[PDB]
Design a protein around this motif. Structure first.
Motif, mmCIF file in Angstrom:
data_model
loop_
_atom_site.group_PDB
_atom_site.id
_atom_site.type_symbol
_atom_site.label_atom_id
_atom_site.label_comp_id
_atom_site.label_asym_id
_atom_site.label_seq_id
_atom_site.Cartn_x
_atom_site.Cartn_y
_atom_site.Cartn_z
ATOM 1 N N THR C 81 -51.697 56.865 15.620
ATOM 2 C CA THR C 81 -52.436 55.886 14.800
ATOM 3 C C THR C 81 -53.996 56.083 14.906
ATOM 4 O O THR C 81 -54.728 55.695 13.988
ATOM 5 N N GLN C 89 -60.755 47.042 23.216
ATOM 6 C CA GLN C 89 -62.038 46.501 22.734
ATOM 7 C C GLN C 89 -62.507 45.418 23.761
ATOM 8 O O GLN C 89 -63.649 45.441 24.245
ATOM 9 N N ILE C 102 -72.440 50.254 33.751
ATOM 10 C CA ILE C 102 -71.991 51.566 33.222
ATOM 11 C C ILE C 102 -73.196 52.574 33.175
ATOM 12 O O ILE C 102 -74.341 52.186 32.889
ATOM 13 N N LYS C 119 -44.639 60.742 14.486
ATOM 14 C CA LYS C 119 -43.299 60.094 14.523
ATOM 15 C C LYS C 119 -43.062 59.192 13.245
ATOM 16 O O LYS C 119 -43.614 58.087 13.143
ATOM 17 N N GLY C 121 -41.450 60.427 9.269
ATOM 18 C CA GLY C 121 -40.623 61.044 8.234
ATOM 19 C C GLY C 121 -41.352 61.011 6.890
ATOM 20 O O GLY C 121 -42.575 60.818 6.866
ATOM 21 N N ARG C 122 -40.628 61.194 5.779
ATOM 22 C CA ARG C 122 -41.267 61.163 4.430
ATOM 23 C C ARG C 122 -41.872 59.729 4.193
ATOM 24 O O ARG C 122 -43.071 59.597 3.891
ATOM 25 N N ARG C 123 -41.033 58.698 4.365
ATOM 26 C CA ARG C 123 -41.425 57.271 4.205
ATOM 27 C C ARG C 123 -41.729 56.649 5.623
ATOM 28 O O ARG C 123 -42.139 55.483 5.729
ATOM 29 N N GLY C 124 -41.508 57.447 6.676
ATOM 30 C CA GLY C 124 -41.765 57.021 8.052
ATOM 31 C C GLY C 124 -41.042 55.797 8.612
ATOM 32 O O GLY C 124 -39.813 55.672 8.524
ATOM 33 N N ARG C 125 -41.823 54.899 9.215
ATOM 34 C CA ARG C 125 -41.298 53.658 9.804
ATOM 35 C C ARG C 125 -41.419 52.524 8.726
ATOM 36 O O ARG C 125 -42.517 52.006 8.476
ATOM 37 N N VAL G 23 -51.448 56.605 9.562
ATOM 38 C CA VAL G 23 -51.836 56.013 10.853
ATOM 39 C C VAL G 23 -50.724 55.089 11.489
ATOM 40 O O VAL G 23 -50.145 55.439 12.527
ATOM 41 N N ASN G 24 -50.446 53.946 10.855
ATOM 42 C CA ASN G 24 -49.476 52.940 11.372
ATOM 43 C C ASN G 24 -47.983 53.417 11.462
ATOM 44 O O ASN G 24 -47.395 53.374 12.550
ATOM 45 N N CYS G 25 -47.382 53.845 10.348
ATOM 46 C CA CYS G 25 -45.958 54.259 10.375
ATOM 47 C C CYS G 25 -45.759 55.816 10.379
ATOM 48 O O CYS G 25 -44.634 56.290 10.597
ATOM 49 N N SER G 26 -46.833 56.575 10.127
ATOM 50 C CA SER G 26 -46.798 58.065 10.128
ATOM 51 C C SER G 26 -46.093 58.660 8.844
ATOM 52 O O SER G 26 -45.428 59.702 8.917
ATOM 53 N N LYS G 27 -46.268 57.996 7.695
ATOM 54 C CA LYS G 27 -45.683 58.447 6.402
ATOM 55 C C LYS G 27 -46.621 59.540 5.758
ATOM 56 O O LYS G 27 -47.797 59.277 5.446
ATOM 57 N N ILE G 43 -66.960 50.032 19.842
ATOM 58 C CA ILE G 43 -66.135 50.411 21.019
ATOM 59 C C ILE G 43 -65.457 49.118 21.604
ATOM 60 O O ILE G 43 -64.605 49.183 22.504
ATOM 61 N N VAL G 44 -65.870 47.971 21.064
ATOM 62 C CA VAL G 44 -65.346 46.644 21.429
ATOM 63 C C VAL G 44 -64.862 45.983 20.091
ATOM 64 O O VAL G 44 -64.146 46.616 19.304
ATOM 65 N N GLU G 45 -65.248 44.732 19.849
ATOM 66 C CA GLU G 45 -64.871 44.058 18.603
ATOM 67 C C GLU G 45 -66.132 44.051 17.673
ATOM 68 O O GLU G 45 -66.294 44.958 16.845
ATOM 69 N N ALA G 55 -75.687 45.255 30.503
ATOM 70 C CA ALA G 55 -74.726 45.661 31.557
ATOM 71 C C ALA G 55 -74.886 47.194 31.865
ATOM 72 O O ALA G 55 -74.691 47.639 33.006
ATOM 73 N N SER G 56 -75.236 47.964 30.835
ATOM 74 C CA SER G 56 -75.435 49.416 30.965
ATOM 75 C C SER G 56 -76.965 49.699 31.127
ATOM 76 O O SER G 56 -77.786 48.770 31.100
ATOM 77 N N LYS G 65 -70.179 54.363 17.677
ATOM 78 C CA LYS G 65 -69.067 53.784 16.903
ATOM 79 C C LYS G 65 -67.767 54.634 17.095
ATOM 80 O O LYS G 65 -67.815 55.764 17.606
#
Lengths: 25, 153, 127, 97, 150, 148, 97, 91, 81
Positions: C81, C89, C102, C119, C121-125, G23-27, G43-45, G55-56, G65
Motif C-alpha cells: 500500500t 504518524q 531527535i 497481493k 489479482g486482476r480485481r484484487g481484494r 495501493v489498498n487492494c492491489s488491483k 511524517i505525522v498527521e 523536540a529536534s 513530506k
RNA sequence: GGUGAAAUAUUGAAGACUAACUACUGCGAAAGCAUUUGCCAAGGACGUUUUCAUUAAUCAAGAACGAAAAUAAACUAUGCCGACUAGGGAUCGGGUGGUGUUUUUUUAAUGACCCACUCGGCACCUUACGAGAAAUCAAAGUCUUUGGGUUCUGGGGGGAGUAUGGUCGCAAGGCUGAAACUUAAAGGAAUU
C-alpha cells in the motif's frame, strides 16, 4: 443470457461427436 | 569410442627439452584444428583457453572445473552443459561458481577452469525412437540397460 | 549532543513496530513491539496504541542511557500500500509529548517498481 | 560507399583475383593495391603483407570473406585477394586502403 | 495513396511553370551533356546524377537545358545501366532484409517488411515485361539476386 | 562508511559508500518532465573498486508560454557518455581521497551544466547513489598514507 | 449506447497500454485506464508543526513530506477516493477542482 | 513428383514409434545433414562426422560444434558476452 | 468566402501556402551565386542543396545538409539567383 | 502476516516493471510495443528546380504476420484509395522567414525559445446549413435533386457458428456451414 458464454457449451457437443469419427473411421 | 560429446586432445610443447606429449581436454563449442589454445594464469580470457577462475571475471562460463588446481579434471565435464562464476571474494582465494542443477560450491581463485561449454548440446533434446541405437551406445559403455519392474520378478 | 543511534520505525497496515538499534542496525537493544499493553489486534492501528508504544521505550532509554533514536518512518513495505500507517504518524507526535529528542527526521519509504505483483489479482481484494 | 569504389576498379581496373595471379603480378612489380579478407586464412593474408613490403603495395582488410569479397568483384564465386595493378582512374589510389 | 501504407504524405517534386529558361546559365547544351555522362561514368545513376547538377553546377532540370532526359541521355552515349533505377535499389534493399533475417530469423515484422519489398518488386517487373525493356521470362529469385545486383 | 582498525577505544572509518533517502529522489522527480539513468564503473591504483551513478533532469527558458515539451532522443545519448568521461579519469590514483576531492565541492555539477549549455542546458544532474564494495586486504603501510 | 468519446479511459489508435499497481487492494489496471491520486501528507498527521521544531535540532530544517503517488483502480477511486458521481455534460471538461 | 507430402526424411522409420516424436526428429535431423557453411574457407563443406565434429571437405578443417546442429539458444548467448568482455580486458 | 477572384489573388495568401496547395506548383525556393573570397569562380548553389558544394581547385563547404534549406557556412558572399 | 470482523545490514544469485519517468501523446499492417547504450538495417512526416513515366486504385483464391491464454468486449464499435465541403486553441515530427526575444566567448556565426504560416497526421470542442430513428458524426456530409472506383457481408428472430461432410494444423481448435420445426414478437436510440 448472452450467446457468447452459451457458444462455449455448444463446442463441447462437437467434442463427443468428434470421438465418434475415431470408433467408425 | 563410448561417449556423447567429443574431446580436444590438446598436445603441449614440453618446456624441459624438444618433447611433445599429447594431453587431453573436453569438447569446446566451436574450436578448429590448429587453434593456438594457450594455457596460463597470465593468458587472457579467450573461449577454449584455460586459467584460474579468480584470475578471471564473474559470469564467465568455463568447463572441466576442479575443486583443486591441477586435478586435470573434475566437475562441469558432461556433454552440452556449463558452469557460471557468481561471486569473487579475493580474501582467501574463494570463487563461488554455479553447476547445472544449482550448486553454490565456492572453490579457490587459482582453481582450474577453461572458458566455453561442452560441444554436444541438444543431445537429449532429440528422441532416439529406435532402442537399437540405445543398444548401439552401450556397445562401448556398460550393461546398465535394459531395466525391468520388480513387480514382474 | 548526547547519545545517538538509529531505529528504522516500520508502520505497515493493521499494526506498528517501535524499536531502537545503533548507527547501523546490527546492534539492536530494547525491542518491545507495539502491543504489550493491548490484546485487541485490530485496536493496534489507531493513535491510542501509538502513544503508549513511544512511552514503553522512553522509560527504558532513561534506565540505561541512550536518548537520541534517529527516526526513519516506513510507509508499508515496497510492493504494498506504501501509505503511512494510522499509527506511524501519532508515533512521532508520541515521542514529542514524552521528551525524546531527535538528531534529524528523514523519510525512507520503499517505492515498488510497479512490479513484484502485489497481493490481489486482476480485481484484487474485493467485497 | 566502399562497395561503390571497388565497383569501378572492376569497371576498368586491372586486378589479380587469385594466389598465383597476385604472385605473378607482384613478381613483375605492376600491382600497387591489395585487399585481404579478415575471415580467410591469416597465413595467406600474411604472405601478401610480407610480399606487400617487397612489391611496395598498400594493404587493406575489408570486412567479410572471399565469397563476400567476391560479391564486390561482381561474380558469384569466391576470391579474397584483390592485387590491383592499374586502377580505374578514381580516388582508389589513396583512399582508406 | 502511398499504396501499402495509410500515410497520406504530399512531399514530392514541384517543377516550375517555366518550360524554357534559365537565361542566367553560362556554358550550353554540350556542357550539361558531357557533365551528365561524367557522373554516369562515375556510377551515380540519374537520381544522384541529377541532384549533383542542381547544387554543384547550375542545372535546375534537364528540360530546362535540352529536349531529352538524363535517362534518355545515358541511352544515347552508351553509358546506361542494364536495369531501372528503382528496380536496382529495390532488389539491393530486398537483399538487406533477406540476408538480415538470416542473421535474425525471428524477425516477424522484418519478414513482412522483406515480403512488401519483394511484393512491390513483382508489381514493378509485372509492367516491365508488359512494356518490353527487360527479359519477359525474368524469374525473381532473390537467391541469385544477392550475387546478381552486386 | 566502513570499520577500519581500533586503537584503545578510538576506531576510525573510511569512505565505502554514499546512499540517499527516498524523499530526495521522489522530490526532484515530478510529472511532465524528463529523467535520465547513467551507469559507470571506476577503479583506483591501491587495488580498490567502487561504482558511481548520475541522474539528470530538465528546465525552462526566457518568456516561456507552454507548461510542457519533451526531448528528441538525439539529446539523452550525448549527455550520458559525457558524465562518465570526466569521473573515470579523475578518481584513479590515491583511491577515494581524490574521488571526494571533486564530488563535495561540486565540479561535476557545473562542468556538464555549462558544456551542453551551448544548445540544451538541463539542471540538477548529481551522483545520487554511489557505493564501494571491493577493498585491497589489510597492510598497515597503505592504510596510513590516508590519515589525519 | 454511443454517448461518450473517451469511452472507457483515453484510448485512440493503439490497443495495448501497460497497467499500474493498486495501493489498498492491489488491483492491476492500465495507467491511463484507472486513476493516479498523489497524496501529500506529513511524517505525522498535520497539527503539531511547532512541536516538531521544539523536540529536534536546527530551525525548521526543510519540512520533510511522505509524498507518494497512490495508484488505485476505478473501483477504489469511487469508494476509497473522490466519488461525487457527475452528470452527462458535467463529464466532458477535464479539470481536478 | 515428390515421394512424401508431410513425412520427408523421417519416412525411413515407417509407422513405428510416436507421431509427435518423429516430428521434432526432422528438425535437428536436417541441421546436421545440411551441408552447412564452413565459417573458415567461406565454402559450405561442414559435415556432421561425430555429433560436434564439423570437418572442412578441403585441407581437412574439423571444428567443434553442437550434437546435430552447430549452436542453439544457449551456445549463442555465451559466445556474445565472452567476446564483448574479451576486448573489455584492454578496455 | 461567398465570392472572390480565385484568378487574381493577393501576394499575401500567395506566399503563405504549400507549393502544391497554391494555384500553380512553382519553386517557393531560390538559387544563390555564393562563393569564397579567394576564388573568382562563383558557385551556383541550390536552396535545399543537401550535397556539400565545393569549388574548382580547393574543395570547401558552402551549404551544410539540413532537413530543409542547407544552412550557410559561417560567412561567404551569397547572391540570390 | 491480516479481514468490516473474530480465527537492518557489510554483499549477492535470478527475474519481473523495465518503476517514477509514461499523458485523450508517439511508432507499427493489424496484433502490438513502455529504460538504456551500440551494431544491423529498415519503414515514415517533412524537404526537393533528383529520376522513371502510369508503372496504377480497390480486391474472390491464394501468401507473411498476429494480444493473451490466428483468436476478444482485436473496437476509431465506424472498409480501403481519390476529391471537395471547416474554423479554432492544441500537440507530435519536419520545413520557411523573422539581424525578433536571448546566449556572453566579442556584435558574431549559430543555437533554444517566442510569433503567424504550415504540411503529415493525433484528437477534442463550438455550431452543421447536411446527414442521421435519435444518440451523435467534417464524417454516418457531397443518398429520391438517389450513380468517382471497388472488396466483403446482412434480409424477423430462433435453430446456429449448430448437422453434414469437405478442408487446414503434431494437437486443442478452426474454416466453411445447413435444414426442418417453432412463434408475433426480437432488436436500436431516445423518453417518461
Amino acid at each position: 443470457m448472452r450467446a457468447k458464454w452459451r457458444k462455449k457449451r455448444t463446442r463441447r457437443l462437437k467434442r463427443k461427436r468428434r470421438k465418434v469419427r475415431a470408433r467408425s473411421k | 569410442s563410448g561417449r556423447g560429446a567429443p574431446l580436444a586432445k590438446v598436445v603441449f610443447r614440453d618446456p624441459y627439452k624438444y618433447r611433445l606429449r599429447e594431453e587431453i581436454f573436453i569438447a569446446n563449442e566451436g574450436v578448429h584444428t590448429g587453434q593456438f589454445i594457450y594455457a596460463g594464469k597470465k593468458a587472457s580470457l579467450n573461449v577454449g583457453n584455460v586459467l584460474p577462475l579468480g584470475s578471471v571475471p564473474e559470469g564467465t562460463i568455463v568447463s572441466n572445473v576442479e575443486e583443486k588446481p591441477g586435478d586435470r579434471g573434475a566437475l562441469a565435464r558432461a556433454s552440452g552443459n556449463y558452469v557460471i562464476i557468481i561471486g569473487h571474494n579475493p580474501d582467501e582465494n574463494k570463487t563461488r561458481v554455479r553447476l547445472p542443477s544449482g550448486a553454490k560450491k565456492v572453490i579457490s581463485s587459482d582453481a582450474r577452469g577453461v572458458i566455453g561449454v561442452i560441444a554436444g548440446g541438444g543431445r537429449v533434446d532429440k528422441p532416439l525412437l529406435k532402442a537399437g541405437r540405445a543398444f548401439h551406445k552401450y556397445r562401448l559403455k556398460r550393461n546398465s540397460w535394459p531395466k525391468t519392474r520388480g513387480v514382474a520378478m | 549532543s548526547q547519545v545517538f543511534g538509529v531505529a528504522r520505525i516500520y508502520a505497515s497496515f493493521n499494526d506498528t513496530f517501535v524499536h531502537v538499534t545503533d548507527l547501523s542496525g546490527k546492534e539492536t537493544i530494547a525491542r518491545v513491539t507495539g502491543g504489550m499493553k493491548v490484546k485487541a489486534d485490530r485496536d493496534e492501528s489507531s493513535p491510542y496504541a501509538a502513544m503508549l508504544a513511544a512511552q514503553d521505550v522512553a522509560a527504558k532509554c532513561k534506565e540505561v542511557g541512550i536518548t537520541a533514536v534517529h527516526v526513519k518512518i516506513r510507509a508499508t513495505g515496497g510492493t504494498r500500500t506504501k501509505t503511512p500507517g494510522p499509527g506511524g504518524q501519532a508515533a512521532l507526535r508520541a515521542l514529542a509529548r514524552s521528551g525524546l529528542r531527535i538528531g534529524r527526521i528523514e523519510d525512507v519509504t520503499p517505492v515498488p517498481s510497479d512490479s513484484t505483483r502485489k497481493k490481489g489479482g486482476r480485481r484484487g481484494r474485493r467485497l | 560507399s566502399i562497395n561503390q569504389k571497388l565497383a569501378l576498379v572492376i569497371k576498368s581496373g586491372k586486378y589479380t583475383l587469385g594466389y598465383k595471379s597476385t604472385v605473378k603480378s607482384l613478381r613483375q612489380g605492376k600491382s600497387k593495391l591489395i585487399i585481404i579478407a579478415a575471415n580467410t586464412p591469416v597465413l595467406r593474408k600474411s604472405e601478401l603483407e610480407y610480399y606487400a613490403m617487397l612489391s611496395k603495395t598498400k594493404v587493406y582488410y575489408f570486412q567479410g570473406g572471399n565469397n563476400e569479397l567476391g560479391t564486390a568483384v561482381g561474380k558469384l564465386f569466391r576470391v579474397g585477394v584483390v592485387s590491383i595493378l592499374e586502377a580505374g582512374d578514381s580516388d582508389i589510389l589513396t583512399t582508406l586502403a | 495513396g502511398r499504396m501499402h501504407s495509410a500515410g497520406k504524405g504530399i512531399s514530392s517534386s514541384a517543377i516550375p511553370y517555366s518550360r524554357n529558361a534559365p537565361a542566367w546559365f553560362k556554358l550550353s547544351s554540350e556542357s550539361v551533356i558531357e557533365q551528365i555522362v561524367k557522373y554516369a561514368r562515375k556510377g551515380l545513376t540519374p537520381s544522384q546524377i541529377g541532384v549533383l547538377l542542381r547544387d554543384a553546377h547550375g542545372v535546375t532540370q534537364a528540360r530546362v537545358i535540352t529536349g531529352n532526359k538524363i535517362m534518355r541521355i545515358l541511352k544515347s552515349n552508351g553509358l546506361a545501366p542494364e536495369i531501372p533505377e528503382d528496380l536496382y535499389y529495390l532488389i539491393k534493399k530486398a537483399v538487406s532484409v533477406r540476408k538480415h533475417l538470416e542473421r535474425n530469423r525471428k524477425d516477424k515484422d522484418a519478414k513482412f517488411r522483406l515480403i512488401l519489398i519483394e511484393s512491390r518488386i513483382h508489381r514493378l517487373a509485372r509492367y516491365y515485361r508488359t512494356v518490353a525493356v527487360l527479359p519477359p521470362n525474368w524469374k525473381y529469385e532473390s537467391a541469385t539476386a544477392s550475387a546478381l545486383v552486386n | 562508511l566502513r570499520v577500519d582498525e581500533v586503537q584503545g577505544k578510538n576506531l576510525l572509518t573510511n569512505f565505502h559508500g554514499m546512499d540517499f533517502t527516498t524523499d530526495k529522489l521522489r522530490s526532484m522527480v515530478r510529472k511532465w518532465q524528463t529523467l535520465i539513468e547513467a551507469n559507470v564503473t571506476v577503479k583506483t591504483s591501491d587495488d580498490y573498486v567502487l561504482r558511481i551513478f548520475a541522474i539528470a533532469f530538465t528546465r525552462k527558458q526566457a518568456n516561456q508560454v507552454k507548461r510542457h515539451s519533451y526531448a528528441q532522443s538525439s539529446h539523452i545519448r550525448a549527455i550520458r557518455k559525457v558524465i562518465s568521461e570526466i569521473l573515470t579519469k579523475e578518481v584513479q590514483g590515491s583511491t577515494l581521497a581524490q574521488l571526494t576531492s571533486k564530488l563535495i565541492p561540486e565540479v561535476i555539477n557545473k562542468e556538464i551544466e555549462n558544456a551542453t549549455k551551448d544548445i540544451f542546458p538541463l539542471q540538477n544532474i548529481h551522483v545520487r547513489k554511489v557505493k564501494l564494495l571491493k577493498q585491497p586486504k589489510f597492510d598497515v603501510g597503505a592504510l596510513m598514507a590516508l590519515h589525519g | 449506447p454511443k454517448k461518450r468519446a473517451s469511452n472507457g479511459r483515453n484510448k485512440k489508435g493503439r490497443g495495448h497500454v501497460k497497467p499500474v499497481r493498486c495501493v489498498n487492494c492491489s488491483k492491476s489496471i492500465p495507467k491511463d485506464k484507472a486513476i493516479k491520486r498523489m497524496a501529500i501528507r506529513n511524517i505525522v498527521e498535520a497539527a503539531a508543526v511547532r512541536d516538531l521544531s521544539e523536540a529536534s535540532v536546527y530551525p525548521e530544517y526543510a519540512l520533510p513530506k511522505t509524498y507518494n503517488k497512490l495508484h488505485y483502480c476505478v473501483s477504489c477511486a469511487i469508494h476509497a477516493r473522490i466519488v461525487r458521481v457527475r452528470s452527462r455534460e458535467d463529464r466532458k471538461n477535464r479539470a481536478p477542482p | 513428383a515428390k515421394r512424401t507430402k508431410k513425412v520427408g526424411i523421417t519416412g525411413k522409420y515407417g509407422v513405428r514409434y510416436g507421431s509427435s516424436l518423429r516430428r521434432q526428429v526432422k528438425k535437428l535431423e536436417i541441421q546436421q545433414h545440411a551441408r552447412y557453411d564452413c565459417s573458415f574457407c567461406g565454402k559450405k563443406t561442414v559435415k556432421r562426422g561425430a555429433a560436434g565434429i564439423w570437418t572442412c571437405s578441403c585441407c581437412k578443417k574439423t571444428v567443434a560444434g553442437g550434437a546435430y546442429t552447430v549452436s542453439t539458444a544457449a551456445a549463442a548467448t555465451v559466445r556474445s558476452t565472452i567476446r564483448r568482455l574479451r576486448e573489455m580486458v584492454e578496455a | 468566402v461567398l465570392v472572390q477572384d480565385l484568378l487574381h489573388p493577393t501576394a499575401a495568401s500567395e506566399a503563405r501556402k504549400h507549393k502544391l496547395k497554391t494555384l500553380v506548383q512553382g519553386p517557393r525556393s531560390y538559387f544563390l551565386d555564393v562563393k569564397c573570397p579567394g576564388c573568382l569562380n562563383i558557385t551556383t548553389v541550390f536552396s535545399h542543396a543537401q550535397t556539400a558544394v565545393t569549388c574548382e581547385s580547393c574543395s570547401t563547404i558552402l551549404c551544410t545538409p539540413t532537413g530543409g534549406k542547407a544552412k550557410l557556412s559561417e560567412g561567404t558572399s551569397f547572391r540570390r539567383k
